[PDB]
Design a protein around this ligand. Structure first.
Ligand code: VGC
Ligand code: MN
Ligand code: MN
Length: 512
C-alpha cells in the first residue's frame, strides 16, 4: 500500500517561518519535495529468520509487567511547550491539572476504550531545522491532538520506558550516554578477533514501516503483563492511530492519508528501534554474519562482527542489504565494511581517541562539526527554543571543536553581554532544561567525567577534520580560537566565584 495519499492541499505553516539569516532553515515551502520522496508503495516479504527473531523478542517481552499511568501522572509528564489542543486547552493547563484538560482527557480515554476502529485525526506540519550548504527539504511531523497524546502516555509510557531495554538488551542505544555508547562500541570492537563493522540507515524509514510492522509491534507490547484497560487502549491506539489515519494541515484542510509510521507519536522512537532491530537481526542471519553485535537507535544501526575477509565481507553486506530490502527497508546509501572503528558513523557520530592527563588513551564520541557550527552560527543572529549550541557543548564536551570553538565563542558572547548568570532553555535527550551557563562544569563532569577538561593528543584525523571544516566554512582557524580562549579564561578568572570555576575547568586547555 502507498505510504501516503495526498489531496493536493498544501502543508501549511502555522507561523512565520525563516529560510535564511550557505546556512538555511527548512520551511513548508519545501514540503512538496519531501512528500514526493516519502510517498511510495511498500513491498514486504517475511521469512523464517524474521519469524525466529520475532519469537525471541516476544519471549523477552513476556517477562515485562507494565502499568497504566493515571491521567494525573500522564499530565505531569507532558512536555511544557507541546502544541495546544483543539479542544480549548494547552500544555500548561495539562501540567497544572486543569479541569478542562482532565475532563477532556478522560473523555478521550473512554472513547479509545469504546471505539477501536475510527481513525483518529492528525496534523501534518513541516519541521523547521537549520542546516548548512543542495538543500534538503523539510522533514514532516505528524501528530494527534494533545488529549490523545496524554492518553498515549497513560496506555504506553510505562511500556516504552521499560520494554525496549528488556527486549533488545545492550543493543538498545537510547540507554547510553555518549561515553557509555563509546564504551559499548569499543568493548564490542576489541572483543572480536578480526573486527569488521558497518553502519546502516534506511531510506525514509518511517515511510517504510508497514501496517504489518505496526501490528507486529503491537503484538510485542501485548506480550507484556498489562492491565485489561491498557490492552484495550493499546489495541485501539494501534488501529485508530498507529497504523494510519487522516492528515490535516494547520488551516484545517484535509491533506491526505497516512499508512505508515507517524513521526509525532509516543511510540515512534521505541517502535522504530524495535522494528529496525527485528529486521536487522533477521538480516544478520540471512547474511550469515559471524558473532554479530548490534547497536540500534531508531533506524541508525551499527553492526560489528568477525571479518570473513575483504571480498567475503563485501558480499555479506550486499546480502544483508538485500534482506533488509525484502523486509521493506532499503538503505539511503549502501553500507560499506569498515576495519577502523573511527570510520563508522551512525547517529551522525563516531568514536575517536584522545589522551587524559595521565597519558591514558580515552575514547569519546565526536562528529563532523559542520552542522553544529552552522546551527551555532544561526543562534548567534536569531535565537530559538533548543539552543543547539549549548546542547552540543554538553553532549560533545570532550571534543576538540566543542571545547575550542563552541565553548570559546559562547562564553565570549556571554561575557560581552554580561549574561553569565542568565539561564537558557536547552533541548537535550528529549527534554527541555533551563540551564545556567555557570553550571556547565558540573554538568559536563557528571555526564563525561573530569577527564573531559583534560583531554589532549587528539587523533590526527579528527584534528584535520576540524581544521578542514573551519576552512570550508570561513571560520577562523584553531590558533585564533586558542588566543580567544586565553582571553575568555582570564576574564572568567577575574570574576572569581563560579565564573572562575568555569575558566579553570572549561578553559584549562588554553593555558600555556
Ligand atoms: C563564518 N563563521 C561562522 C560560521 C558561519 C556559518 C556556518 C558555520 C560557522 C562562525 C560560527 C559562530 C558561532 C560558533 C561557531 C562558529 C564564526 S565565528 C567567526 C569569527 O570571525 O570570529 C566567523 C564565523
Ligand atoms: Mn533513515
Ligand atoms: Mn536515521
Amino acid at each position: 500500500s502507498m505510504s501516503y495519499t495526498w489531496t493536493g492541499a498544501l502543508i501549511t505553516p502555522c507561523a512565520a517561518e525563516e529560510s535564511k539569516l550557505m546556512v538555511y532553515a527548512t520551511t513548508s515551502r519545501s514540503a512538496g519535495l519531501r512528500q514526493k520522496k516519502v510517498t511510495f508503495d511498500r513491498l514486504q516479504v517475511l521469512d523464517d529468520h524474521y519469524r525466529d527473531v520475532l519469537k525471541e523478542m516476544k519471549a523477552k517481552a513476556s517477562t515485562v509487567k507494565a502499568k497504566l499511568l493515571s491521567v494525573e501522572e500522564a499530565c505531569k509528564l507532558t512536555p511544557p511547550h507541546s502544541a495546544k489542543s483543539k479542544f480549548g486547552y494547552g500544555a500548561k493547563d495539562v501540567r497544572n491539572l486543569s479541569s478542562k484538560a482532565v475532563n477532556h482527557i478522560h473523555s478521550v480515554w473512554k472513547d479509545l476504550l469504546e471505539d477501536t476502529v475510527t481513525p483518529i485525526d492528525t496534523t501534518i506540519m513541516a519541521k523547521n531545522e537549520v542546516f548548512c550548504v543542495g538543500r534538503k527539504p523539510a522533514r514532516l511531523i505528524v501528530f494527534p491532538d494533545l488529549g490523545v497524546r496524554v492518553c498515549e502516555k497513560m496506555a504506553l509510557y510505562d511500556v516504552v520506558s521499560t520494554l525496549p531495554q528488556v527486549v533488545m538488551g545492550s543493543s538498545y542505544g537510547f540507554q547510553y550516554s555518549p561515553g557509555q555508547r563509546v564504551e559499548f562500541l569499543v568493548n564490542t570492537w576489541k572483543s572480536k578477533k578480526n573486527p569488521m563493522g558497518f553502519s546502516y540507515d534506511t531510506r525514509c524509514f518511517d515511510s517504510t514501516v508497514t501496517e504489518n510492522d505496526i501490528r507486529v509491534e503491537e503484538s510485542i507490547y501485548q506480550c507484556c503483563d498489562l492491565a485489561p484497560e491498557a490492552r484495550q487502549a493499546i489495541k485501539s491506539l494501534t488501529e485508530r492511530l498507529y497504523i494510519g489515519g487522516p492528515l490535516t494541515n494547520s488551516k484545517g484542510q484535509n491533506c491526505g492519508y497516512r499508512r505508515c509510521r507517524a513521526s509525532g507519536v509516543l511510540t515512534t522512537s521505541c517502535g522504530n528501534t524495535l522494528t529496525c532491530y527485528l529486521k536487522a537481526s533477521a538480516a544478520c542471519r540471512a547474511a550469515k554474519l559471524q558473532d554479530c553485535t548490534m547497536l540500534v537507535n531508531g533506524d541508525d544501526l551499527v553492526v560489528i562482527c568477525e571479518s570473513a575477509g575483504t571480498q567475503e565481507d563485501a558480499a555479506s553486506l550486499r546480502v544483508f542489504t538485500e534482506a533488509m530490502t525484502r523486509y521493506s527497508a532499503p538503505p539511503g546509501d549502501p553500507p560499506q565494511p569498515e576495519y577502523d572503528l573511527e570510520l563508522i558513523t551512525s547517529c551522525s557520530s563516531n568514536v575517536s581517541v584522545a589522551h587524559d592527563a595521565s597519558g591514558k588513551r580515552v575514547y569519546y564520541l565526536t562528529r563532523d562539526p559542520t552542522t553544529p557550527l552552522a546551527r551555532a552560527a544561526w543562534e548567534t543572529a536569531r535565537h530559538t527554543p533548543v539552543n543547539s549550541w549549548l546542547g552540543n557543548i554538553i553532549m560533545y564536551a570532550p571534543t576538540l571543536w566543542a571545547r575550542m570553538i563552541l565553548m570559546t565563542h559562547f562564553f565570549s558572547i556571554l561575557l560581552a553581554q554580561e549574561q553569565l548568570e542568565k539561564a537558557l532553555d536547552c533541548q537535550i535527550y528529549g527534554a527541555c532544561y533551563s540551564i545556567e551557563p555557570l553550571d556547565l562544569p558540573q554538568i559536563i563532569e557528571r555526564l563525561h567525567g573530569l577527564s573531559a577538561f583534560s583531554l589532549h593528543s587528539y587523533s590526527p584525523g579528527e584534528i584535520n577534520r576540524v581544521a578542514s571544516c573551519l576552512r570550508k566554512l570561513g571560520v577562523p582557524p584553531l590558533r585564533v580560537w586558542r588566543h580567544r580562549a586565553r582571553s575568555v579564561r582570564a576574564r572568567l578568572l577575574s570574576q572569581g566565584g563560579r565564573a572562575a570555576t568555569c575558566g579553570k575547568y572549561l578553559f584549562n586547555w588554553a593555558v600555556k
